[PDB]
């Protein structure tokens, strides 16, 4: 069956471009989805006879990729994110021992599923220091029972597997944003077998395509707590006006076919609020656009000033606040987008200090980066550490290795620099 294994490895091997062209598939589907018309049901193809029938497959074709992609994700980030969580929880026990001590309830939420996972043998599935549990008994075990902490801790293929880890693992799979994303996507894909028009929503995937749209959504959502006040205030105001409108001003709300015939003005408290909520919350041209006036009558000055209050407190304040609420934010996170390159090219991403001091030599601070600090070099140094045996470790790398063991990471520069320190 190993051809299928390596074929999935091809699948991951080309994971992005499939995603991209798939989205181009759905985009094309959706362009061409611009044709069906009921007679009841019927589809208006133009020229070629094969477009709708290709879709009989294309849906599924697209859907195939969905199915495809999901499995690939299982081969992709999944073991990575599992590795990530693994390192997380593990280092947490390494220094904090929260399950020994600062345990979660449904509060400190992440840990609620994570309680059970430690019990399993196979907790350290992929941390490549997969012996940590015994260090944990080594440290936190003396405070308690050395074996009480161990009480906490320490085809053929079907029966092997190991059990309790698994449900937590699929739960971590649930934790992912991307996996809900592709899952919602695929569920929609199977909806395409049910109906190709509900199948259109895949285009939403463009929201992740690419960063710019993700910029947009991020523009919206980082601060919806701010949205609360606005929609709230809007609702507020709308009550505020509407109630008096149900009081002092019912008689202006007609939208009768001009001539005196009975109509759907006001009529209910709800209905009037939703009248303004359909209209006045939009307005643009205002409530005064469709209120029945002049009028020309009693309390006219007050309805007019009413209109004015509506036109300032709403038309102007609310909407705009929302608008700035968004825009300032787009410029915010965008400014953070340029700010990356700016900080990379100014303050050193490592030693800090600032480019300024290393620009003293011409073109110099890039040399202070890639040719000195670089940054990836740290990590390449780490793999270099990991591959070497401890016997052959040079003493510097060895204490540094220990510092890896202890994770203070203090030996990364305060910001002093060698040639800066000397000359």
């Amino acid at each position: 069956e190993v051809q299928r294994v390596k074929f999935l490895n091809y699948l991951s091997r080309n994971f992005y471009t499939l995603r991209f062209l798939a989205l181009f598939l759905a985009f094309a589907i959706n362009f061409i989805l611009l044709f069906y018309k009921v007679s009841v049901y019927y589809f208006l193809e133009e020229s070629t006879g094969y477009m709708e029938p290709a879709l009989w497959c294309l849906s599924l074709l697209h859907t195939l990729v969905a199915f495809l992609c999901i499995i690939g994700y299982n081969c992709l980030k999944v073991p990575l994110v599992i590795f990530k969580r693994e390192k997380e929880l593990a280092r947490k026990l390494e220094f904090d021992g929260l399950y020994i001590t600062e345990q979660p309830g449904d509060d400190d939420v992440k840990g609620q599923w994570d309680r059970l996972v430690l019990n399993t043998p196979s907790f350290p599935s992929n941390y490549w220091d997969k012996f940590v549990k015994r260090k944990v008994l080594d440290k936190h075990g003396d405070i308690f029972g050395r074996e009480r902490i161990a009480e906490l801790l320490g085809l053929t293929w079907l029966m092997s597997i190991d059990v309790k880890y698994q449900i937590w693992k699929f739960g971590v799979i649930f934790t992912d944003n991307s996996f809900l994303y592709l899952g919602w996507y695929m569920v929609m894909s199977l909806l395409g077998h049910y109906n190709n028009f509900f199948f259109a929503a895949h285009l939403l995937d463009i929201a992740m395509g690419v960063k710019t749209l993700r910029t947009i959504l991020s523009s919206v959502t980082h601060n919806g707590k701010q949205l609360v006040m606005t929609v709230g205030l809007l609702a507020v105001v709308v009550y505020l006006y509407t109630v008096v409108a149900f009081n002092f001003f019912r008689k202006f709300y007609n939208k009768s076919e001009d001539e005196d015939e009975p109509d759907m003005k006001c009529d209910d408290m709800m209905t009037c609020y939703l009248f303004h909520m359909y209209v006045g919350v939009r307005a643009g041209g205002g409530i005064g656009d469709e209120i029945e006036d002049p009028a020309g009558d009693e309390y006219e000055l007050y309805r007019v000033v009413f209109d004015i209050t509506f036109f300032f407190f709403v038309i102007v304040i609310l909407l705009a606040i929302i608008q700035g609420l968004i825009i300032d934010a787009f410029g915010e996170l965008r400014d953070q987008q340029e700010q990356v390159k700016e900080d990379m090219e100014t303050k050193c991403f490592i030693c800090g200090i600032g480019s300024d001091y290393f620009d003293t030599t011409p073109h110099g601070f890039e040399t202070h980066t890639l040719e000195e600090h670089n940054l990836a070099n740290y990590m390449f140094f780490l793999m270099y550490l990991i591959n070497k045996d401890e016997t052959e470790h040079t003493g510097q790398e060895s204490y540094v290795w220990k510092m890896y063991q202890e994770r203070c990471w203090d030996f990364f520069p305060a910001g002093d620099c060698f040639r800066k320190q000397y000359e």
Binding site: D359, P362, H363, G364
Partner: protein
């Protein structure tokens, strides 16, 4: 004191003067001087030069803090010289 005594006729010469700092190949900054041709100076004054300089400065300060200030500068000079090589033709 001696300069002021000799300062009596130097003013005629400042137009003609060209002066600049240079950080020479010995870790000091010389304040050398040099003459500037007037016929060349005249050509500098009006066409797509002063404006080109408004342009060029915009061409640099738009990305000027990079140490190509020295380098981007190069071509402009060589270019305007070519411009005077053209200006001479008319």
């Amino acid at each position: 004191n001696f300069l002021e005594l000799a300062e009596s006729i130097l003013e005629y010469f400042r137009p003609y003067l060209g002066r600049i700092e240079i950080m020479g190949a010995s870790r000091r900054i010389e304040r050398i001087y040099f003459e500037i041709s007037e016929t060349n100076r005249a050509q500098w004054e009006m066409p797509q030069v002063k404006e080109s300089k408004r342009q060029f400065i915009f061409d640099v300060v738009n990305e000027g803090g990079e140490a190509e200030k020295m380098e981007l500068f190069v071509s402009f000079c060589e270019d305007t010289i070519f411009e005077m090589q053209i200006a001479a033709q008319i």
